[PDB]
Each structure stands twice: as structure tokens, then as C-alpha cells.
Amino acid sequence: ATGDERFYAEHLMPTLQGLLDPESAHRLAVRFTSLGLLPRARFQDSDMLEVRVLGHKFRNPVGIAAGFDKHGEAVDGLYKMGFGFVEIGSVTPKPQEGNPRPRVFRLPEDQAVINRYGFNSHGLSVVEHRLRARQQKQAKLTEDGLPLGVNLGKNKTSVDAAEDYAEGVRVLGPLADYLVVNVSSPNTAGLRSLQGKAELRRLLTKVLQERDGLRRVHRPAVLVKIAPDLTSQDKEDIASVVKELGIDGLIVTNTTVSRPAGLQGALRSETGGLSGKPLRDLSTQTIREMYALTQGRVPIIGVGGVSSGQDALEKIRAGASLVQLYTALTFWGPPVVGKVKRELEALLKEQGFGGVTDAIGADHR
Ligand SMILES: CN(C)c1cccc(-c2c(F)cc(-n3nnc4c3C(=O)c3ccccc3C4=O)cc2F)c1
Ligand SMILES: Cc1cc2nc3c(=O)[nH]c(=O)nc-3n(C[C@H](O)[C@H](O)[C@H](O)COP(=O)(O)O)c2cc1C
Ligand SMILES: CCCCCCCCCCCC[N+](C)(C)[O-]
Ligand SMILES: O=C(O)c1cc(=O)[nH]c(=O)[nH]1
Ligand code: NA
Ligand code: NA
Numbered sequence: 001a002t003g004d005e006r007f008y009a010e011h012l013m014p015t016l017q018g019l020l021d022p023e024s025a026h027r028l029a030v031r032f033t034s035l036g037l038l039p040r041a042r043f044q045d046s047d048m049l050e051v052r053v054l055g056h057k058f059r060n061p062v063g064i065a066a067g068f069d070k071h072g073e074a075v076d077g078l079y080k081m082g083f084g085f086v087e088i089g090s091v092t093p094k095p096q097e098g099n100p101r102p103r104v105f106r107l108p109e110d111q112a113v114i115n116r117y118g119f120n121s122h123g124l125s126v127v128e129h130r131l132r133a134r135q136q137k138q139a140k141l142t143e144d145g146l147p148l149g150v151n152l153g154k155n156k157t158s159v160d161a162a163e164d165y166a167e168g169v170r171v172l173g174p175l176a177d178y179l180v181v182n183v184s185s186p187n188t189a190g191l192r193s194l195q196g197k198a199e200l201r202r203l204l205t206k207v208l209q210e211r212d213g214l215r216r217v218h219r220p221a222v223l224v225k226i227a228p229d230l231t232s233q234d235k236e237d238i239a240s241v242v243k244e245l246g247i248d249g250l251i252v253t254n255t256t257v258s259r260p261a262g263l264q265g266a267l268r269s270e271t272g273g274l275s276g277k278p279l280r281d282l283s284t285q286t287i288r289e290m291y292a293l294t295q296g297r298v299p300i301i302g303v304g305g306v307s308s309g310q311d312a313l314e315k316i317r318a319g320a321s322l323v324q325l326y327t328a329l330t331f332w333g334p335p336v337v338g339k340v341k342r343e344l345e346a347l348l349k350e351q352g353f354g355g356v357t358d359a360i361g362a363d364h365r
């Protein structure tokens with residue numbers, strides 16, 4: 001456990017980063033993971049990490065965020081890594097290549113990444129068939145407390161964003177425990193402007209209609225994923241629409257197009273979304289605000305700069321029922337998953353919580 005953690009963090013990951021540019025390293029990470037080339041996590045999930053939310057059991061509250069496995073190629077490997085749930089995507093209706101390379105940048109001095117992938121996607125049909133090949137295997141995983149989320153995007157050339165998302169609901173909804181719609185990615189022109197109220201209501205109404213039209217055992221929860229870059233007005237409006245329409249949850253947050261003061265990385269002024277440690281507390285505060293605006297009645301998946309039990313627990317106490325991480329993997333490697341779970345368990349005990357569920361939103365009380 002702690003042996004592998006130190007070796008990866010101090011030696012192996014710095015060495016890999018020295019050899020491979022970020023996108024190449026990402027591709028290698030997906031390949032290794034899809035092949036199961038990693039230590040089968042020794043950390044046995046305890047009962048106090050179990051969470052029941054979004055109509056499912058989650059064996060532990062630590063998930064892999066969207067964008068690591070964009071095309072659904074490494075799902076089983078990610079469960080093997082110890083994630084309590086897996087979110088794939090974003091997936092666009094038609095295949096598209098995304099932005100020109102280079103489009104991924106490391107900021108090692110900041111434990112951050114900047115990306116402008118631009119929703120590179122194999123497209124719905126490819127991902128549909130990939131998930132169909134393991135549909136019953138997933139049904140069993142979900143029953144065993146390891147659910148699957150699918151994050152739905154839209155094509156760069158789309159004329160009707162709502163129809164892109166509707167297509168995603170129809171094609172991948174039947175294969176997902178939950179679906180995600182971003183009003184929040186920084187690398188598609190006009191995507192975030194789906195945050196405006198009357199239009200946001202229109203979009204999400206259409207998405208929920210399509211979801212409701214699926215057969216009962218194929219009917220996923222629907223969540224909205226937001227950026228940390230929203231105005232106070234934006235957040236009020238989203239909270240209102242989410243409650244009005246009965247949206248099942250929020251993912252808080254995507255990457256930031258802000259550049260917090262103090263970034264040291266040479267590549268800090270690259271265009272794209274910033275992830276990792278400089279995002280952490282901005283994300284946590286966005287969780288805190290959305291939890292309050294929804295009266296704690298709307299499940300939140302908290303994400304941004306998590307690499308420790310403390311980071312995870314801060315988001316849970318702020319209002320998250322579950323958390324995700326991504327960028328930590330790129331600096332700590334696979335052992336970070338067991339690290340976060342072990343540290344989270346220890347902190348829950350230390351702060352007198354019976355389990356994760358008791359800690360959700362605790363700061364507000
Ligand atoms: C040694 N073994 C068995 C093993 C198994 C499974 C995975 C890995 C693994 C890893 F988890 C992460 C990386 N990695 N290194 N630098 C970066 C990455 C990224 O994944 C990444 C992703 C997105 C933007 C940027 C990056 C990025 O800069 C490289 C890996 F090989 C290693
Ligand atoms: C390289 C990269 C690609 C990403 N791609 C997506 C994506 O396709 N869809 C999405 O909703 N979020 C995407 N994200 C955002 C992550 O899901 C997550 O919200 C964000 O990175 C903050 O978590 P972290 O600090 O633990 O990385 C991506 C992030 C990174 C770093
Ligand atoms: C309140 C705005 C702050 C902007 C970003 C804050 C980053 C916190 C620095 C701690 C991260 C740990 N490390 C090793 C990556 O430096
Ligand atoms: O594909 C991308 O560029 C991307 C999508 C998203 O939702 N978030 C992010 O940081 N990048
Ligand atoms: Na399934
Ligand atoms: Na379902």
C-alpha cells in the first residue's frame with residue numbers, strides 16, 4: 001500500500017512524465033488500465049465508505065471523473081484500480097477529432113493540468129457497441145455497488161445542442177446508471193452559454209423527457225455538470241431550474257478557465273481548462289454554494305483537485321455525497337485511489353462520523 005504509493009509518487013510518475021508528453025502519457029495510462037496492468041488494490045472497502053444515492057449503492061465514494069476514459073475503453077480496469085464508480089465520456093453524437101495538438105499541458109509546480117482536448121470522441125455508436133459488449137457484466141457490477149456514469153457532449157458543428165444531448169440520452173442512457181450533461185466545458189464554443197435560465201430549462205426539459213421515455217430498467221439518473229466559473233446569478237438560476245425540473249443531481253465542478261494568482265508552471269497561460277490543486281477550493285466552495293441553494297436535497301458529486309482523504313472529506317462536508325478525481329492520477333498514479341480511501345476512512349473516524357453518509361453536508365449544520 002504505502003510502499004507502492006511512495007514509489008509511484010517519488011520515482012515512477014516523475015520518470016514517466018520526463019519521458020512522455022501529457023497526451024501520450026494519458027494514452028498510455030488508458031492502455032495500461034484497459035489491460036489491467038496495475039496492482040489489484042489491496043484496500044478492502046469498509047462499510048463506512050458505502051453510500052446510497054442516485055438510486056444506487058456505491059461501494060466507496062471515490063470515482064474517476066469524466067475525460068480520462070472518454071470512449072469507454074478502460075471501464076473494468078478502472079474498477080480494478082479501486083474506484084467506487086466510473087464516469088466515461090464526454091461522448092459526442094458523431095465522431096470528432098477535437099483540437100490540434102498539443103492540447104494537454106502539465107503544470108508540475110502547481111500539481112495542475114491545462115487541457116483543450118475539444119471533446120475528441122469516438123462518437124455514440126462506437127461507445128454504444130463497446131458498452132453493449134459488457135452490458136451484463138456492468139449490470140452485475142452495479143448490483144455489487146459499482147455504478148457507471150456516462151457524460152454526454154455535443155458536436156462542434158451542432159446546430160441544436162438540445163438534440164445532441166437528446167440523441168445521447170437515447171443511445172447511451174439505456175447503458176448507464178447515470179447520465180451527465182455539461183453546462184460547463186471550456187473548450188467548445190458556446191457550450192457554457194447553456195447556463196442561461198429559460199434556455200437551460202428548455203434544454204433540460206428535453207433531456208428529461210427523453211430519459212423518462214426509456215424503459216424502467218434502462219432509465220438512468222440525470223445530472224448536470226457545472227464549471228466553477230459561474231456568476232452568483234448563474235448559480236441561483238441553475239439551482240432553481242434543477243429543483244423545478246427534478247434533476248437528479250449535480251457534478252461540481254468541471255475545470256476552470258480562470259487562472260488563480262500564484263500559478264508557477266511555465267505553461268500557465270495556455271488556453272484551456274485548469275484542473276488539479278489550483279482548482280480544489282474553488283470547486284469546494286462551488287459545492288458549498290450549490291448545496292445551500294438546493295437545500296441539501298440535490299445530490300452533488302464533488303470534483304476538483306482531490307488527492308487526499310482531507311480533500312475528499314472537505315468536499316463531502318461541504319455537501320458532496322460522492323467525489324471524483326482525475327488530475328491526481330497523472331501525478332500520483334493508480335495508488336492514489338487507495339490512498340484517498342484509506343485517509344478518508346481514518347478522518348471520518350477521527351471526526352466522529354459513523355460513515356460517509358453522516359458527513360455529507362456536515363459543515364452546514
Ligand atoms: C505504471 N502503471 C502500472 C500504470 C498503470 C495505469 C496507469 C498509469 C499511468 C497514469 F495513471 C498516469 C499517467 N500520466 N502521466 N502523466 C500524465 C498521465 C495521465 O494519465 C494524464 C491524463 C490526462 C492529462 C494529462 C496526463 C499526464 O500528464 C501515466 C500512466 F502510465 C500507470
Ligand atoms: C485532460 C482532461 C480531460 C477532461 N475531459 C472532460 C470531459 O470530456 N468531460 C467532462 O465533463 N470533464 C472533463 N474533464 C474534467 C474532469 O472531469 C474534472 O471535472 C476536472 O478535471 C477536475 O477534477 P481534477 O482536479 O481531479 O482533475 C477533463 C479533465 C482533464 C484534466
Ligand atoms: C483562493 C485561490 C487559490 C488558487 C489556487 C490554490 C492552490 C493551493 C496550493 C496547494 C496545492 C499543493 N501543491 C503541491 C500543488 O502546491
Ligand atoms: O474535451 C475537452 O476539452 C474537455 C471537456 C470538459 O468537459 N472539460 C475539460 O476540461 N476538457
Ligand atoms: Na448494464
Ligand atoms: Na437504470
Ligand code: NA
Nearest residue numbers: 231232233234
Ligand atoms: Na451574479
